[PDB]
Structure formats: structure tokens, C-alpha cells
Amino acid sequence: GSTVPRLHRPSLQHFREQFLVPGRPVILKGVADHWPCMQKWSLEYIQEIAGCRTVPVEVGSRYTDEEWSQTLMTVNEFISKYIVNEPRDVGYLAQHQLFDQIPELKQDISIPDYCSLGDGEEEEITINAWFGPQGTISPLHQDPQQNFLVQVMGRKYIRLYSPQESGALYPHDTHLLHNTSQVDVENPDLEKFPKFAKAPFLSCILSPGEILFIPVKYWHYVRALDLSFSVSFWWS
Ligand SMILES: CNC(=N)NCCC[C@H](N)C(=O)O
Numbered sequence: 001g002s003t004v005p006r007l008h009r010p011s012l013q014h015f016r017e018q019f020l021v022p023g024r025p026v027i028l029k030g031v032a033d034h035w036p037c038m039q040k041w042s043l044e045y046i047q048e049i050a051g052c053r054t055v056p057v058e059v060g061s062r063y064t065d066e067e068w069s070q071t072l073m074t075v076n077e078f079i080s081k082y083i084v085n086e087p088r089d090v091g092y093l094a095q096h097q098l099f100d101q102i103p104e105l106k107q108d109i110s111i112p113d114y115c116s117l118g119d120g121e122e123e124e125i126t127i128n129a130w131f132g133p134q135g136t137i138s139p140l141h142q143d144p145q146q147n148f149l150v151q152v153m154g155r156k157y158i159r160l161y162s163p164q165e166s167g168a169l170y171p172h173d174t175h176l177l178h179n180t181s182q183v184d185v186e187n188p189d190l191e192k193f194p195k196f197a198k199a200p201f202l203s204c205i206l207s208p209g210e211i212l213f214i215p216v217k218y219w220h221y222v223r224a225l226d227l228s229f230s231v232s233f234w235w236s
């Protein structure tokens, strides 16, 4: 397919009419690139401000693996065990509302102006942190809300499939995982999932300072290319 469009600070109206309403993905430049987090956030700063706090940690390459698990530890332990000391396994501080837990970190980010284009309340917006080493993989899935995924540290390779292509993505037959694809995006078993091949997609490498708008129910697949930290905003 082709690359996700990059727009420098588009007006609220242009974003509403060209991406929000028709549900098209877009990268927003010049919006979050000067949030205090962009130059302040590093291992040391995160250790100093958050190192002592308990956080949920996902262990295993993908959350669809059988030998995959969720455990608890301090931020310092996570960085030590799963980032800097030659990790033995993939650890990932994923989908954790770190900013409700640590209000001092919320100072370093903001609510994107584009969120007020929706029907939801600003404080009903779910803010999650995505902190982990190079190689963390989030398998193909969809979320029930609009998403502003802001990249702070490192880069992320992201694959996007429109909800119309849901048939060729073979969602799990479980209810519980029905929002998660059965296909390994970067190595698809075409013999078991032959329709995944002709399914068109958008993709991009998301870099620090860039915001990825993921339309509601838009399927996304995410792999960290470096030591990465992302902040997702779920809104309506
Ligand atoms: C997205 N990656 C991950 N390693 N954990 C959280 C996955 C739960 C949820 N369904 C989601 O992707 O938002």
C-alpha cells in the first residue's frame, strides 16, 4: 500500500471533514512536537519521577502467544530487567494509565485540540502509556474508540487495515478476542489465511513528535524499532 499522510497542524475543520468523519488515518506534524515530554523524557527522568511506582508488565513477544503473561513490578525493575540489562524476554509496560497514577507525568503532555471535535467529555478520555524496549509487538487488533497515538521516544513501524477488510483479517472466534486478528502481519500463514494477502493497507514509521490518528475500529499493528515510549489518547 501507501504511506499514511502527514499534515502540519491542520485546522480543526480540515481534520474533521477529511479524516474524522470519513474515518481516514493521518499523521499530524507540528502538534505534539514541543510538548515538554519530547525533550524531558528519558530513562533517567522516568526513573527519577516514576521508578518507585508499581506498574503492570506484559511478558512475551505477542499477547496472542500461549506462553504470554502479565505481572507486576516497579518502573525501575522494568527498565532494569527488560531494557538495559540484556533482556532475556520481551517485557512491555503497555496500556497502563500511567498518568492517572503519576499526575506529575501528565504535566508533560496535553489533550490534543482535535479531541473536542467528538461527543465525549475531556476527562472521560483514556490516556495510556506504552513503554518498552526495541522489538515489542502489538498484534493486529481494533479498538472501540478514536485514537491519537503520540510518539515520544524511539520509532514504531505501524500497519493499518480498514474495518472493511475485516474479513481478510480472520478475527478470533471467541468474543473475548474477536477484536484481535489471527494473522501474524509480518509473517502471515497464507496457507491458513489466504485472503490476508490481497487486503490493501496503509503503513508508516512513526517518529518522535508525530501523532498517529487511528480512526475508531481501524485495525492497527505496532512494532517498536527502538527503545520506544508512546502515549495513546482514546476519545469519542
Ligand atoms: C497493544 N499491545 C499490547 N501488548 N497490549 C494491550 C492489548 C490489549 C488491547 N486489546 C489493545 O490492543 O488495546
Ligand SMILES: O=C(O)CCC(=O)C(=O)O
Binding pocket: 130, 137, 138, 143, 147, 149, 156, 220, 222, 223, 230, 232
Ligand atoms: O503502540 C502499541 O504497541 C499499540 C498501541 C495501541 O494498540 C493503541 O494505542 O490503541
Ligand SMILES: [Zn+2]
Binding pocket: 141, 142, 143, 220
Ligand atoms: Zn490499540
